[PDB]
Amino acid sequence: IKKVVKLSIPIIVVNLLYTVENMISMILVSSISPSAVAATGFSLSLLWFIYSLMALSYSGTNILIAQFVGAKKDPSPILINGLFLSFLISLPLFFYGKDFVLFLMKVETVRSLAKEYLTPIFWFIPIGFLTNTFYGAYNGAGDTKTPMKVAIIMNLTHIGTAYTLINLGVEGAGWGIAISEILAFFIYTFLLIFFLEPKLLFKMVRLGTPTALERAITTLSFNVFVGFLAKFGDKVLAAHQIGLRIESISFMIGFGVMIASTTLAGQNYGARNYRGMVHAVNTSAHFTALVMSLTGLILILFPHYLVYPFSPEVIEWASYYLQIVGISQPAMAYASIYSGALKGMGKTHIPLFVNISSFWLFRIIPSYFLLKVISPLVPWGFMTFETAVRALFYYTVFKKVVGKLL
């Protein structure tokens, strides 16, 4: 009856582009010197700790622009302050990005290879933060295909510039990244020839700081979860990335649907139309529930038919993942639609408490007590469905917010 796929599908393609290009950055820098992947791998773990500050300017911009779009009000002050906020947040990371990543290798030449590969990035993260503001800008207004063809261009300009500059060695890998980042920025900046007070900038920090603490603390909860499964040999530890690469790609359906709701619940919140918002997230819940069920069920019925690409013991252990995580997919559908609908409703502090509570005292503490007494099916077990409930039964929070908001 509605048009949520109009917003979610192009965002998933950008995410599909986000994941396809990251996996290509694996093979483009794994041709010569196999010891250089440690530079690539150990960078993104710190990059995801670094790119936790994106949400500071991203969430503040994606939410406040969407709310103003539904409210018909002018989003130009939010746009000019969004890029300014990202530019302010990029100012310390410009200088403190060079030495902090080099020191955060404690987790003589194993780390010196990332020095040359990451430096062209740290020169143009200030040019990167602005595009993360631009992505939240178009995602807040509704026009979600303009950021896709920009992603398409940026994806194919990198893989072009990467393969060109690698085949410099590893510095051209980071240089293919920076060239595409600034290019899409120039594309975006050139698109501003076609289509302000401090108090507004002050509030965007109030919407980004809880969301920046979400993707930053989650990094600490992820680093220990994989650390649970080193005591189970190499067959299992080599079955995670076979399961993650399949799940991280299958998870982009919700992340896109999430932002599809971060805008849709945002515009209708600003338009004073509770008939337009409660129906959407309810239908976008059932729609993604029935969609992610077609995805997660295909994982369970066809295990080896999907692990086989990069796989017999590993076929056995990885199938016990796809089948097992494939059960939580109906709740990831119910997850990204809830904790993303309350982002668009200005209550960004609420999803902060959601994921901290679901991850920790449901996925982690129960695993460590049952892993030290049992098997890699123990974490994955409580990792799947068993946590999904805190993503499921938290509609209550949604259903007690609006039910009293009327």
Side-chain angles (χ1 to χ4, degrees):
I1 170 178
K2 66 193 194 327
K3 218 80 252 84
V4 156
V5 297
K6 185 179 181 181
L7 308 169
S8 60
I9 289 182
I11 296 183
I12 298 162
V13 176
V14 178
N15 293 128
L16 246 177
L17 270 39
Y18 171 81
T19 306
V20 162
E21 182 181 349
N22 287 19
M23 300 260 291
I24 286 306
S25 312
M26 307 191 309
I27 313 180
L28 270 183
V29 208
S30 69
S31 48
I32 44 94
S33 187
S35 40
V37 191
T40 302
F42 296 158
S43 301
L44 312 181
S45 299
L46 308 189
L47 283 189
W48 250 123
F49 196 95
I50 276 186
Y51 293 158
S52 308
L53 307 179
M54 294 286 183
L56 259 169
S57 57
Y58 173 71
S59 300
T61 313
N62 180 33
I63 298 162
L64 266 183
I65 280 187
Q67 293 180 354
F68 279 54
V69 160
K72 312 168 182 179
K73 215 171 186 175
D74 193 6
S76 295
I78 303 170
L79 179 55
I80 70 100
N81 288 284
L83 54 95
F84 191 74
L85 196 158
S86 59
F87 172 65
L88 287 190
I89 300 308
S90 60
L91 187 61
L93 186 52
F94 201 1
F95 303 95
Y96 291 161
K98 180 171 181 175
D99 295 334
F100 181 83
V101 68
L102 188 152
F103 167 76
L104 205 42
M105 302 304 301
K106 186 181 174 181
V107 59
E108 52 202 46
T109 329
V110 184
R111 61 186 187 271
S112 181
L113 301 181
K115 171 80 170 189
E116 299 174 356
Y117 155 72
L118 289 179
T119 31
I121 309 179
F122 296 130
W123 299 344
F124 311 103
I125 309 197
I127 322 295
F129 268 104
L130 305 174
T131 50
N132 175 268
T133 296
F134 278 101
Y135 261 100
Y138 301 104
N139 288 27
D143 200 315
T144 49
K145 184 178 176 177
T146 298
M148 181 194 66
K149 287 204 167 189
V150 166
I152 298 173
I153 293 165
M154 182 163 48
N155 279 250
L156 302 189
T157 310
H158 164 225
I159 306 174
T161 314
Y163 184 82
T164 307
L165 277 47
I166 297 168
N167 299 77
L168 296 177
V170 84
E171 185 174 340
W175 256 117
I177 295 177
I179 285 183
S180 53
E181 277 279 335
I182 68 187
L183 186 63
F185 171 71
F186 297 136
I187 299 177
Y188 278 146
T189 319
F190 177 68
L191 285 183
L192 295 198
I193 320 185
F194 290 165
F195 50 88
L196 52 106
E197 275 287 306
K199 186 65 181 293
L200 183 80
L201 184 277
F202 185 76
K203 291 182 180 179
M204 309 197 317
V205 195
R206 289 183 170 180
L207 304 177
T209 310
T211 317
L213 259 180
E214 175 205 282
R215 299 169 200 175
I217 297 187
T218 310
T219 307
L220 184 60
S221 298
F222 179 79
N223 281 13
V224 196
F225 206 102
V226 189
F228 279 159
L229 304 183
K231 300 180 181 178
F232 299 151
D234 314 321
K235 309 295 173 169
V236 179
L237 250 183
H240 295 359
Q241 74 166 14
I242 306 186
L244 178 61
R245 290 173 185 171
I246 296 182
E247 281 313 302
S248 56
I249 295 184
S250 299
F251 183 76
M252 306 175 306
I253 308 300
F255 181 79
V257 161
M258 177 191 77
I259 313 175
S261 52
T262 306
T263 300
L264 197 49
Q267 298 181 352
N268 298 269
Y269 188 31
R272 295 182 180 179
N273 214 27
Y274 296 83
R275 183 217 67 91
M277 57 182 311
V278 186
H279 293 54
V281 290
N282 176 247
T283 313
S284 315
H286 298 351
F287 172 77
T288 322
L290 310 184
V291 158
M292 290 271 78
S293 307
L294 176 61
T295 309
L297 182 58
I298 286 180
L299 301 169
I300 309 176
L301 301 179
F302 310 97
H304 31 273
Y305 290 85
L306 193 47
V307 177
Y308 190 58
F310 294 105
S311 73
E313 297 160 325
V314 189
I315 315 183
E316 176 190 353
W317 281 117
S319 297
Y320 283 163
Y321 197 65
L322 292 192
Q323 296 178 150
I324 273 191
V325 295
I327 318 180
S328 52
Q329 301 293 336
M332 320 309 298
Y334 278 14
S336 302
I337 194 63
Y338 150 73
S339 295
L342 298 197
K343 278 185 184 177
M345 297 179 61
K347 309 310 173 186
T348 57
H349 65 283
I350 294 185
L352 169 67
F353 187 81
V354 173
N355 298 88
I356 294 181
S357 298
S358 67
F359 260 107
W360 218 240
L361 61 152
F362 279 83
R363 234 170 314 195
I364 295 279
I365 309 179
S367 299
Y368 176 80
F369 292 158
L370 295 187
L371 265 178
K372 216 172 183 178
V373 306
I374 302 302
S375 168
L377 262 59
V378 174
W380 310 355
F382 292 79
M383 140 85 184
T384 192
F385 215 81
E386 151 80 297
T387 7
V389 49
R390 303 289 278 188
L392 287 176
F393 198 70
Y394 268 60
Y395 278 82
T396 52
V397 183
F398 173 80
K399 290 190 178 185
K400 305 289 184 178
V401 154
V402 188
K404 285 74 197 164
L405 205 53
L406 298 173

